[PDB]
Amino acid sequence: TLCDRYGLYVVDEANIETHGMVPMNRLTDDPRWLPAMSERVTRMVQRDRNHPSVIIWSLGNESGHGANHDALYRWIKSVDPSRPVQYEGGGADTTATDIICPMYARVDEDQPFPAVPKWSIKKWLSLPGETRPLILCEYAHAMGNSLGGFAKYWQAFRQYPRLQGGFVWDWVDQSLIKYDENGNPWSAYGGDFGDTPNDRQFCMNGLV
Amino acid sequence: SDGSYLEDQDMWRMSGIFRDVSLLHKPTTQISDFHVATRFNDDFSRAVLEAEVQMCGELRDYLRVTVSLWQGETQVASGTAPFGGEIIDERGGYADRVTLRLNVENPKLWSAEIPNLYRAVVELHTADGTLIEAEACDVGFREVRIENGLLLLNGKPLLIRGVNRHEHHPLHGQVMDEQTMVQDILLMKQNNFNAVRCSHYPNHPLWYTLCDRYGLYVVDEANIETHGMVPMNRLTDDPRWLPAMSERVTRMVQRDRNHPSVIIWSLGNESGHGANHDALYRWIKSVDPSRPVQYEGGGADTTATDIICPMYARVDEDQPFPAVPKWSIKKWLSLPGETRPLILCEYAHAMGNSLGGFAKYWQAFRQYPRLQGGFVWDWVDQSLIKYDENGNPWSAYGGDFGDTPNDRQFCMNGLV
């Protein structure tokens, strides 16, 4: 409602992420989990389809690429033809996405990982057969004293018509407040609550 | 002559009888034309050689044509037939033509790396076996095509290491001889070139034979350039000049279509973009579907080209001229709708102490699949020899002969 009134475009994302599985698509390629995944996508579209601020649907995050993704992609295109669908998993340019949407691809340098390469963004646009626009679903990791090289993305976004921008990672540091002996508040991160194993300061990635 | 309006290339303007003169004796019943074509299976393990032969003179029942294919001293395939094509339309077929199909198993493929040639002999003879005349050419088995935005030879993506070459000799002007042609080809291959662009006219006929034998890819170009017109397409958009332009393209294709080294046809150079270009583009695609057609004029990506072929576009920087912008090459590939491969028909101007930034093109050509290389401008400096008072030779350029107006040292652009 507030994004409708003040004016922001929204990408609305299904609550599905299975990053800790080996391989990443162990559940999303299995037909017994297709019921559970379909509830997460269908109920989101049925709740949010009337908001003008929502302009793109997303199938979730970091779940590899399985046949359950292609089925749900097609379900949305059929009940709501008015918004594009995007999905980054499985190498960012699968058949479950209308937009090429890499995470952390660089402007000029290739990162040629097996199965899921991250081409540089200028090269990706022009791979034989490729016609979709490219919007980074995550770029420029803002962890601590960071954002070096930010100007180089903005120079590319303005020069190339099919590079249409991206989403910085991310808005706000996820730190929590603890109290010392004198009751003075201090900012805490992973491991400060006796939680174990944990990933330490990696939860603080914000611009604010 | 009025032909001069079509011959405005950047070069010395000279005149006379500058290539060979011959007499040829043929019998009254003769072979008047023949074409050779090669078709392949998915993995290049089986080929069909298709030869079409046409005759002139009086048709008799006893006439026969034989085509044999030789690899060195070994006959590899052979076919014989009487005259008479298949039915073509409601009025019948060509009585004075015949098509032979020869099967070849595991043919050795032609490329610039390994230039394997066969010899095709075409005999016109009687049924009892008296020979009337023979003709022959060198045959290379190769397939050139554009598939999914890439230019492929024999199923693999080419990387063109090309140069533009003019026919120029400092003593003899525009007269070419075997010795100079061979010297150029050796130096080109010793310096890692695999391709040459005939800037900007058909070459001496021996040139194509030597590129077949030593292995270079050739771009063969029609003698049409109208650079000095305002605007550049004043003649090429005018239907009264369509006859003159069509003779320049059709006669080149009819002379050179059998050479394996020719892999791309070009419609000419710097003539803007007019409707005469689209018509001739379509004429070639229809008589010779086996080679792509390219044309740079009119902004390098018009409907008269199968390949985007800019001249002097930069790697990273745009040059946004009105009507005919030169995008940087990485950006051009990805303009909305664009799917063709990009090969620069001229890049890296080698005038004097030059070629700075050359490494930056080669880094891009290797990183991007649809950037498939280009042709440097150019091979040899066009300077001429003058003599001083003591008879000492010195190298001369525009203006040194009292020619006026002239363009000074701009004629010297070579790597050698």
Ligand SMILES: OC[C@H]1NC[C@H](O)[C@@H](O)[C@H]1O
């Ligand atoms: O030397 C400049 C160069 N520019 C482009 C032309 O095609 C060439 O003939 C030559 O004039």
Ligand SMILES: [Mg+2]
């Ligand atoms: Mg010119």
